[PDB]
Design a protein around this ligand. Structure first.
Ligand SMILES: CC(C)c1cccc(CNC[C@@H](O)[C@@H]2C[C@H](C)CCCCCCCCC(=O)N(C)[C@@H](C)C(=O)N2)c1
Length: 377
């Protein structure tokens, strides 16, 4: 009965994807950001200028105080609060209710977004990166332990204001085309994967493949951009600049600061290259690739002035904590987080990104020797 979960995600460009949830008795409705890059379930539980609503523990007869504080520092943004448990349900999800850990956010810094429509975050990664430590059971672990929901979920994140699906407990075959290609989960903490090759417009970047995974590579729906280790970022930007050199862009555009605009419908997509990321496969010396179009890594942004042009931000930025395959990478792919089999699947999404002469793709098999050497230790 996955049809009930199709289209259960909404969001705004650059502001994440959220799902509707309820917490407590009587149920309090809240919109919750879907984040495969963290492992804490947390909701606003005190007034805040950007919160339309929040969790009111005093009104829930099933709330239980854990008498323990918590804080989570992300790559950007952080919050602190009080731990507790309560009953939680997902209206457009499985027909179950579970008692889960909940962090009641009392203070936050650059976490909530002005006018975003979500009030909390659902960390879907593993206990090893939960705060305050790995003894705080994450939501999805509680769900699997307390119900018959199979130990996997899938994400169909769609571009253009945005929507998608989080299929809890399985794979919905109407949401993708072609074959699913799987890459091993290297270690159950983040959803960590191994990138074994990078090509831009079919040209190999020719770096030590360890550089691609320094110090890790993760699949993270809570991060907007494709984030790349310093050395990889420099090579990729150098290649993307060259391919698009027939037009001049401010240096702040390549840093993700300034936006670029063009007359509505005249965006020169053809001058921006496709990026191919090769992932470690399931059998010996085998990989597969996902191909990323510029319509993914040129994120559309509301024209702050006169909505007469098409304006974009460069959605590839530099990282000092490894590669992050963020939302703009996941968009247009159907991504299966197969926890039960320790693998992540990719297929072309039913809401795939369109170009006139090019198409996003998931292609295999490829032969790749010595893939284990690509993981950083
Ligand atoms: C929580 C622990 C496990 C942790 C520490 C450091 C990195 C990571 C990796 N995942 C980060 C991710 O969980 C984290 C989640 C967000 C704060 C959730 C709220 C904002 C969502 C919409 C705007 C997204 C802008 C963006 O890209 N951000 C805001 C990056 C930069 C980021 O940080 N994202 C996890």
């Amino acid at each position: 009965s996955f049809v009930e979960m199709v289209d259960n995600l909404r969001g705004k460009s650059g502001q994440g994807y959220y799902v509707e949830m309820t917490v407590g008795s009587p149920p309090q409705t809240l919109n919750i950001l879907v984040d495969t890059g963290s492992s804490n379930f947390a909701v606003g539980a005190a007034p805040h200028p950007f919160l339309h609503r929040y969790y009111q523990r005093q009104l829930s007869s099933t709330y239980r105080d854990l008498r323990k504080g918590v804080y989570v520092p992300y790559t950007q943004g952080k919050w602190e609060g009080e731990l507790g448990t309560d009953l939680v349900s997902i209206p457009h999800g499985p027909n179950v209710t579970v008692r889960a850990n909940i962090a009641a956010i009392t203070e936050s810094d650059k976490f909530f977004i002005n006018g975003s429509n979500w009030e909390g975050i659902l960390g879907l990664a593993y206990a090893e990166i939960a705060r305050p430590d790995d003894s705080l059971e994450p939501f999805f672990d509680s769900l699997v332990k307390q119900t018959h929901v199979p130990n996997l979920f899938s994400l169909q994140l769609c571009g253009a204001s945005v929507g998608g699906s989080m299929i809890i407990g399985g794979i919905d075959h109407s949401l993708y085309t072609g074959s699913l290609w799987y890459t091993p989960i290297r270690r159950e903490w983040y959803y960590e994967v191994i990138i074994v090759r990078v090509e831009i417009n079919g040209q190999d970047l020719k770096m030590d493949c360890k550089e691609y995974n320094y110090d890790k590579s993760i699949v993270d729906s809570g991060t907007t951009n494709l984030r790349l280790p310093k050395k990889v970022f420099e090579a990729a930007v150098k290649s993307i600049k060259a391919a698009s050199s027939t037009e001049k862009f401010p240096d702040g555009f390549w840093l993700g600061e300034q936006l670029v605009c063009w007359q509505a419908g005249t965006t020169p997509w053809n001058i921006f290259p496709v990026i191919s990321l090769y992932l470690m496969g399931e059998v010996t010396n085998q990989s597969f690739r996902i191909t990323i179009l510029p319509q993914q890594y040129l994120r559309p942004v509301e024209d702050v002035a006169t909505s007469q042009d098409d304006c974009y931000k460069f959605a590839i930025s530099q990282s000092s904590t490894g590669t992050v395959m963020g939302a703009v990478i996941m968009e247009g792919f159907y991504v299966v987080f197969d926890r039960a089999r320790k693998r992540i699947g990719f297929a072309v999404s039913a809401c795939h990104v369109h170009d006139e002469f090019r198409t996003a793709a998931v292609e295999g098999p490829f032969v790749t020797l010595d893939m284990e050497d690509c993981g950083y230790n």
